[PDB]
Amino acid sequence: LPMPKFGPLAGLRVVFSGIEIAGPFAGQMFAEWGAEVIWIENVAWADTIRVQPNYPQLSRRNLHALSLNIFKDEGREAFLKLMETTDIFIEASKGPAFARRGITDEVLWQHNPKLVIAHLSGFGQYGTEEYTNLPAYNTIAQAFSGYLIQNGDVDQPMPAFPYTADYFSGLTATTAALAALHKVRETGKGESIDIAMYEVMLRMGQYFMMDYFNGGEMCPRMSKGKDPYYAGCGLYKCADGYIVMELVGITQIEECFKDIGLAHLLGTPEIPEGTQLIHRIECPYGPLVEEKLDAWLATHTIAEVKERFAELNIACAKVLTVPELESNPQYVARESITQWQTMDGRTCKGPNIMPKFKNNPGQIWRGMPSHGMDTAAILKNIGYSENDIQELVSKGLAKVED
Amino acid sequence: LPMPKFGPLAGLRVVFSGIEIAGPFAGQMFAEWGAEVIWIENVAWADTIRVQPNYPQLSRRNLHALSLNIFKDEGREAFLKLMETTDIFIEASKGPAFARRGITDEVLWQHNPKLVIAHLSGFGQYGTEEYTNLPAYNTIAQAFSGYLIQNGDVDQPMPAFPYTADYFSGLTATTAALAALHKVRETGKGESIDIAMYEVMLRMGQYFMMDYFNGGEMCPRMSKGKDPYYAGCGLYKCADGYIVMELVGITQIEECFKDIGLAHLLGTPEIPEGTQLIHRIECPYGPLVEEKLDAWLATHTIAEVKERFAELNIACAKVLTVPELESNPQYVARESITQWQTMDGRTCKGPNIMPKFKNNPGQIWRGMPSHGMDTAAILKNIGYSENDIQELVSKGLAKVED
Ligand SMILES: CC(C)(COP(=O)(O)OP(=O)(O)OC[C@H]1O[C@@H](n2cnc3c(N)ncnc32)[C@H](O)[C@@H]1OP(=O)(O)O)[C@@H](O)C(=O)NCCC(=O)NCCS
Ligand SMILES: CC(C)(COP(=O)(O)OP(=O)(O)OC[C@H]1O[C@@H](n2cnc3c(N)ncnc32)[C@H](O)[C@@H]1OP(=O)(O)O)[C@@H](O)C(=O)NCCC(=O)NCCS
């Protein structure tokens, strides 16, 4: 398939089947970095992402679009012929849906013994009858993993937003597939990967849950965006708006207490010499620290706080709104936001390729493809004749460019 | 270094320098999957994660601990000797701190031309004077990327929790390093990677921001954990507690409207045949949909809703609290939560290895190492004599087991 040679993953061949965020995010990250990535959509209906007015121009860029019925007769045979030249296949389904329909890992490996197979599901490839075959999106994974219950304000839990669990799961899939690919080079045999979304989010939520699993108590939710345990950490108000700060480190704590009028607290049983963190609940002075911190901050503008905190090596930042991003000097300097052309010939704006590879930078070479756009090209490249593909379209088993 | 042979990354050698979550998360994910991973801590002070009572038993398991002054005299030489046998080096610093201290990418490559170098920072390896050298933690990256402003309730923004941006950044580092490693096999030359935390989070926050960058408006924050745009999506109340649901799909919408008493709305200008999603703001019936949905749900128990939604292929789940996780049948069946022994000989409980590799499963083989534990072993393995290492300890340039 015609495309430029770029990035660390040039020459790698990736195929994915899945809709919305998680599966396709995993697949498309390969394309950001140079790989040849085929997006499989069903024949009768298209990916549900196409209902979003602008996002798909970013989340589906650099992709080739195949539209094929991968489970039915000649569609199935065509799909399995494609697998012979495929290095990595990402699939997102309700549990072991592929195996249930006859496309097992053993069947796939009969066509390509080196193939890396990544199964993404809500609840895993096996477990109980009750959960294994259930559909899942982001919020389902947050609910089932204890992540949702940790987010929100004290009295009101809420999901992390937007679609946080989908990105973590997709990213985990990408990472695991690349790890397995490394093993194929060193062993010459394929791998199968079982990524359950709830297990991904369970790991991302352990910072305080590890206390519960090991004798302790679970932490509360944040109060108005302040860390539930550590004073001087999270969201604060200055005289002219919101900032964030992290009061961490021996020196930072000593100079900040001095600033806020609390120098006498240094060297007490719960804040002894060398204290790197002040625990707002274990220390009797916790609420007092917050009271004086709040009052000192309300006396200063964001700019003044930034300068003093720059002097103390205290991490902080103004909370930026979306309209403030484009013209930020750091964004401009690094080209964090760029422009590209859509397939239809319109100018689209959005984030550039991330991260920055020094020797082999990624690039945007293609806008989001249309439904069935590359079908005729992909099938011809795997041995199908013009009339033979015409029969796949007529039988309802494949769709070509509109 | 003595360790079992397991996982897709057996025989890979990884070194990381960084503290807390992001850097070490990237490094330790290699160790979950079989790699030999060296954790570098400073000599005079240890990783700040050690202040957490339980989490480090999970986040630092499977690791070898080196304690060395990588920038000073014989410590520097020892570090650069280690790099000769290292495949991947992860470093987390304030901007280009390594280069500023004399350890440039060109210097590193003089010792190992195939080395993959991953630089993790808040604001990148280059940019403006104002931002590039600033310290960063999770909340700083959320603030600077527009992620924080999207999380929380309508009237109250708040960070995603816990330390969400740290895990995304660490995971991106792992993925990029593995992608670059693939290129080294196919080109025989090293790579340098510039991962700025704010650019990572900028990408994770695009779902609705793409509308703003392309003519449209930015969405509001969620109201009590309901999707800002799409009805039937997010957090709801049943008669006996919180659930989450995603009302997505042609069939799901038709049968659910029928259930809630809104069948007559189907086939109207804004809900025409084939509608996969109901937009709560573009549709005049949006608030009515929510009103009837809320009332129908309040009539039913969680269990009843689950059964009916299982009949309709509508994704949903009870919102689980932390105490409900251990004894959940899916968690038990898959061993999602397991037990292991610490270095001190105590039983520790927490998440198992994720994800599940079929042919080469990861395993927990070592608990979290002590400060300086493997120093003498690592230095001896790179050509240092017992007396020569004794001088590194005495000069304050290295620390050995306590
Ligand atoms: C997202 C999800 C709920 C959607 O599933 P769905 O409601 O059944 O909708 P789909 O369009 O994917 O599936 C319809 C059917 O077509 C099949 N199908 C999918 N792609 C096909 C193709 N290219 N050709 C022929 N059939 C196809 C599916 O297998 C499914 O049949 P099944 O019930 O036997 O498994 C589900 O795929 C899932 O839980 N995935 C795992 C988690 C995930 O990825 N979530 C999305 C994160 S945003
Ligand atoms: C986390 C962070 C704020 C801490 O930085 P810090 O306050 O300077 O604390 P450190 O202990 O890391 O650094 C102290 C000094 O020791 C140096 N140092 C670090 N490891 C060393 C080692 N093994 N031997 C000798 N010196 C070392 C550092 O370079 C630094 O000196 P510098 O100012 O010239 O750069 C910073 O590393 C950072 O912004 N990292 C990038 C983003 C990130 O990883 N955040 C953490 C996510 S939880």
PDB file of N, CA and C and ligand atoms in Angstrom, chain A residues 17 19-23 40-42 68-71 92-94 97 100-101 120-122 134-138 166 197, chain B residues 252 313, ligand 1:
ATOM      1  N   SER A  17      -9.592  -4.778  14.475  1.00  0.00           N
ATOM      2  CA  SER A  17     -11.046  -4.858  14.413  1.00  0.00           C
ATOM      3  C   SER A  17     -11.599  -4.446  15.768  1.00  0.00           C
ATOM      4  N   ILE A  19     -14.250  -0.842  17.465  1.00  0.00           N
ATOM      5  CA  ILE A  19     -14.892   0.444  17.195  1.00  0.00           C
ATOM      6  C   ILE A  19     -14.623   1.417  18.336  1.00  0.00           C
ATOM      7  N   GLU A  20     -15.032   2.669  18.136  1.00  0.00           N
ATOM      8  CA  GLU A  20     -14.957   3.714  19.159  1.00  0.00           C
ATOM      9  C   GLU A  20     -13.522   4.049  19.554  1.00  0.00           C
ATOM     10  N   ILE A  21     -13.183   4.001  20.838  1.00  0.00           N
ATOM     11  CA  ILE A  21     -11.848   4.417  21.277  1.00  0.00           C
ATOM     12  C   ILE A  21     -10.813   3.299  21.462  1.00  0.00           C
ATOM     13  N   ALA A  22     -11.041   2.358  22.389  1.00  0.00           N
ATOM     14  CA  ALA A  22      -9.943   1.515  22.943  1.00  0.00           C
ATOM     15  C   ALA A  22      -9.143   0.688  21.925  1.00  0.00           C
ATOM     16  N   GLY A  23      -9.824  -0.210  21.217  1.00  0.00           N
ATOM     17  CA  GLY A  23      -9.210  -0.980  20.135  1.00  0.00           C
ATOM     18  C   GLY A  23      -8.530  -0.125  19.072  1.00  0.00           C
ATOM     19  N   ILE A  40     -10.353  -2.426  10.022  1.00  0.00           N
ATOM     20  CA  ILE A  40     -11.481  -3.225   9.527  1.00  0.00           C
ATOM     21  C   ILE A  40     -12.796  -2.702  10.098  1.00  0.00           C
ATOM     22  N   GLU A  41     -13.716  -2.350   9.204  1.00  0.00           N
ATOM     23  CA  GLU A  41     -15.082  -2.001   9.571  1.00  0.00           C
ATOM     24  C   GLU A  41     -15.990  -3.090   9.014  1.00  0.00           C
ATOM     25  N   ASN A  42     -17.169  -3.254   9.604  1.00  0.00           N
ATOM     26  CA  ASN A  42     -18.145  -4.199   9.077  1.00  0.00           C
ATOM     27  C   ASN A  42     -18.674  -3.691   7.731  1.00  0.00           C
ATOM     28  N   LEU A  68     -15.044  -5.427   5.328  1.00  0.00           N
ATOM     29  CA  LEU A  68     -15.131  -6.852   5.002  1.00  0.00           C
ATOM     30  C   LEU A  68     -15.858  -7.637   6.094  1.00  0.00           C
ATOM     31  N   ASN A  69     -16.653  -8.628   5.681  1.00  0.00           N
ATOM     32  CA  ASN A  69     -17.327  -9.532   6.616  1.00  0.00           C
ATOM     33  C   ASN A  69     -16.408 -10.695   6.948  1.00  0.00           C
ATOM     34  N   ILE A  70     -15.649 -10.507   8.017  1.00  0.00           N
ATOM     35  CA  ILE A  70     -14.548 -11.381   8.399  1.00  0.00           C
ATOM     36  C   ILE A  70     -14.994 -12.756   8.917  1.00  0.00           C
ATOM     37  N   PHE A  71     -16.297 -12.918   9.145  1.00  0.00           N
ATOM     38  CA  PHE A  71     -16.838 -14.182   9.650  1.00  0.00           C
ATOM     39  C   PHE A  71     -17.644 -15.014   8.647  1.00  0.00           C
ATOM     40  N   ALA A  92     -11.014  -6.133  19.465  1.00  0.00           N
ATOM     41  CA  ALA A  92     -11.816  -5.759  20.615  1.00  0.00           C
ATOM     42  C   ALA A  92     -13.222  -6.329  20.474  1.00  0.00           C
ATOM     43  N   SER A  93     -13.614  -7.147  21.444  1.00  0.00           N
ATOM     44  CA  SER A  93     -14.866  -7.885  21.380  1.00  0.00           C
ATOM     45  C   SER A  93     -15.401  -8.090  22.781  1.00  0.00           C
ATOM     46  N   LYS A  94     -16.640  -8.566  22.859  1.00  0.00           N
ATOM     47  CA  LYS A  94     -17.235  -9.032  24.104  1.00  0.00           C
ATOM     48  C   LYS A  94     -16.651 -10.391  24.481  1.00  0.00           C
ATOM     49  N   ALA A  97     -15.301 -13.618  21.792  1.00  0.00           N
ATOM     50  CA  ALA A  97     -16.257 -13.629  20.678  1.00  0.00           C
ATOM     51  C   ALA A  97     -15.668 -14.194  19.385  1.00  0.00           C
ATOM     52  N   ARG A 100     -15.497 -17.988  19.716  1.00  0.00           N
ATOM     53  CA  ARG A 100     -16.873 -18.477  19.686  1.00  0.00           C
ATOM     54  C   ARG A 100     -17.410 -18.573  18.258  1.00  0.00           C
ATOM     55  N   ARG A 101     -16.939 -17.685  17.388  1.00  0.00           N
ATOM     56  CA  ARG A 101     -17.346 -17.690  15.990  1.00  0.00           C
ATOM     57  C   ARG A 101     -16.462 -18.548  15.086  1.00  0.00           C
ATOM     58  N   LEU A 120      -8.669  -7.457  23.312  1.00  0.00           N
ATOM     59  CA  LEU A 120      -9.118  -6.448  24.262  1.00  0.00           C
ATOM     60  C   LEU A 120     -10.605  -6.680  24.546  1.00  0.00           C
ATOM     61  N   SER A 121     -10.954  -6.808  25.825  1.00  0.00           N
ATOM     62  CA  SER A 121     -12.344  -7.003  26.222  1.00  0.00           C
ATOM     63  C   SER A 121     -12.596  -6.296  27.540  1.00  0.00           C
ATOM     64  N   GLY A 122     -13.867  -6.206  27.931  1.00  0.00           N
ATOM     65  CA  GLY A 122     -14.213  -5.576  29.202  1.00  0.00           C
ATOM     66  C   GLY A 122     -13.742  -6.407  30.378  1.00  0.00           C
ATOM     67  N   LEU A 134     -19.902  -9.932  28.699  1.00  0.00           N
ATOM     68  CA  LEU A 134     -20.608  -8.648  28.797  1.00  0.00           C
ATOM     69  C   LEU A 134     -19.949  -7.573  27.940  1.00  0.00           C
ATOM     70  N   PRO A 135     -20.753  -6.694  27.317  1.00  0.00           N
ATOM     71  CA  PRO A 135     -20.205  -5.523  26.637  1.00  0.00           C
ATOM     72  C   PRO A 135     -19.637  -4.516  27.637  1.00  0.00           C
ATOM     73  N   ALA A 136     -18.686  -3.706  27.186  1.00  0.00           N
ATOM     74  CA  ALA A 136     -18.058  -2.718  28.051  1.00  0.00           C
ATOM     75  C   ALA A 136     -17.653  -1.496  27.269  1.00  0.00           C
ATOM     76  N   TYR A 137     -17.794  -0.347  27.928  1.00  0.00           N
ATOM     77  CA  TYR A 137     -17.183   0.910  27.540  1.00  0.00           C
ATOM     78  C   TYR A 137     -16.431   1.448  28.761  1.00  0.00           C
ATOM     79  N   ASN A 138     -15.721   2.557  28.563  1.00  0.00           N
ATOM     80  CA  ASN A 138     -14.979   3.268  29.609  1.00  0.00           C
ATOM     81  C   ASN A 138     -15.605   3.281  31.009  1.00  0.00           C
ATOM     82  N   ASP A 166     -10.686   3.962  28.399  1.00  0.00           N
ATOM     83  CA  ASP A 166     -10.511   3.550  27.001  1.00  0.00           C
ATOM     84  C   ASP A 166      -9.080   3.784  26.506  1.00  0.00           C
ATOM     85  N   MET A 197     -10.110  -4.769  30.334  1.00  0.00           N
ATOM     86  CA  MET A 197     -10.151  -3.350  30.718  1.00  0.00           C
ATOM     87  C   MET A 197     -10.161  -3.112  32.239  1.00  0.00           C
TER      88      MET A 197
ATOM     89  N   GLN B 252     -30.571  -0.791  20.758  1.00  0.00           N
ATOM     90  CA  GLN B 252     -30.563  -0.399  22.159  1.00  0.00           C
ATOM     91  C   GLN B 252     -31.459   0.824  22.420  1.00  0.00           C
ATOM     92  N   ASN B 313     -28.479  -5.870  25.092  1.00  0.00           N
ATOM     93  CA  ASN B 313     -27.076  -5.603  24.743  1.00  0.00           C
ATOM     94  C   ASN B 313     -26.697  -4.143  25.044  1.00  0.00           C
TER      95      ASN B 313
HETATM   96  C1  LIG C   1     -17.797  -2.070  22.085  1.00  0.00           C
HETATM   97  C2  LIG C   1     -18.688  -3.309  22.151  1.00  0.00           C
HETATM   98  C3  LIG C   1     -19.634  -3.172  23.348  1.00  0.00           C
HETATM   99  C4  LIG C   1     -19.556  -3.320  20.899  1.00  0.00           C
HETATM  100  O1  LIG C   1     -20.081  -4.614  20.674  1.00  0.00           O
HETATM  101  P1  LIG C   1     -21.492  -4.852  19.920  1.00  0.00           P
HETATM  102  O2  LIG C   1     -22.573  -4.112  20.660  1.00  0.00           O
HETATM  103  O3  LIG C   1     -21.807  -6.317  19.833  1.00  0.00           O
HETATM  104  O4  LIG C   1     -21.299  -4.154  18.488  1.00  0.00           O
HETATM  105  P2  LIG C   1     -20.328  -4.692  17.325  1.00  0.00           P
HETATM  106  O5  LIG C   1     -20.582  -3.875  16.076  1.00  0.00           O
HETATM  107  O6  LIG C   1     -18.869  -4.606  17.709  1.00  0.00           O
HETATM  108  O7  LIG C   1     -20.725  -6.248  17.153  1.00  0.00           O
HETATM  109  C5  LIG C   1     -21.789  -6.722  16.350  1.00  0.00           C
HETATM  110  C6  LIG C   1     -21.468  -8.126  15.831  1.00  0.00           C
HETATM  111  O8  LIG C   1     -20.715  -8.019  14.636  1.00  0.00           O
HETATM  112  C7  LIG C   1     -19.539  -8.801  14.712  1.00  0.00           C
HETATM  113  N1  LIG C   1     -18.464  -8.153  13.931  1.00  0.00           N
HETATM  114  C8  LIG C   1     -17.569  -7.192  14.341  1.00  0.00           C
HETATM  115  N2  LIG C   1     -16.778  -6.861  13.289  1.00  0.00           N
HETATM  116  C9  LIG C   1     -17.148  -7.585  12.209  1.00  0.00           C
HETATM  117  C10 LIG C   1     -16.687  -7.647  10.892  1.00  0.00           C
HETATM  118  N3  LIG C   1     -15.709  -6.860  10.454  1.00  0.00           N
HETATM  119  N4  LIG C   1     -17.291  -8.513  10.002  1.00  0.00           N
HETATM  120  C11 LIG C   1     -18.339  -9.307  10.414  1.00  0.00           C
HETATM  121  N5  LIG C   1     -18.792  -9.243  11.714  1.00  0.00           N
HETATM  122  C12 LIG C   1     -18.210  -8.398  12.601  1.00  0.00           C
HETATM  123  C13 LIG C   1     -19.250  -8.939  16.202  1.00  0.00           C
HETATM  124  O9  LIG C   1     -18.492 -10.083  16.536  1.00  0.00           O
HETATM  125  C14 LIG C   1     -20.643  -8.963  16.803  1.00  0.00           C
HETATM  126  O10 LIG C   1     -21.139 -10.287  16.835  1.00  0.00           O
HETATM  127  P3  LIG C   1     -21.063 -11.227  18.155  1.00  0.00           P
HETATM  128  O11 LIG C   1     -22.198 -10.835  19.075  1.00  0.00           O
HETATM  129  O12 LIG C   1     -21.188 -12.688  17.759  1.00  0.00           O
HETATM  130  O13 LIG C   1     -19.747 -11.057  18.880  1.00  0.00           O
HETATM  131  C15 LIG C   1     -17.853  -4.604  22.212  1.00  0.00           C
HETATM  132  O14 LIG C   1     -17.116  -4.797  21.025  1.00  0.00           O
HETATM  133  C16 LIG C   1     -16.927  -4.711  23.388  1.00  0.00           C
HETATM  134  O15 LIG C   1     -17.455  -4.916  24.669  1.00  0.00           O
HETATM  135  N6  LIG C   1     -15.615  -4.613  23.153  1.00  0.00           N
HETATM  136  C17 LIG C   1     -14.614  -4.744  24.197  1.00  0.00           C
HETATM  137  C18 LIG C   1     -14.391  -3.466  25.007  1.00  0.00           C
HETATM  138  C19 LIG C   1     -14.223  -2.281  24.081  1.00  0.00           C
HETATM  139  O16 LIG C   1     -13.428  -2.333  23.136  1.00  0.00           O
HETATM  140  N7  LIG C   1     -14.979  -1.219  24.331  1.00  0.00           N
HETATM  141  C20 LIG C   1     -14.942  -0.027  23.504  1.00  0.00           C
HETATM  142  C21 LIG C   1     -14.113   1.061  24.176  1.00  0.00           C
HETATM  143  S1  LIG C   1     -14.586   2.693  23.564  1.00  0.00           S
END
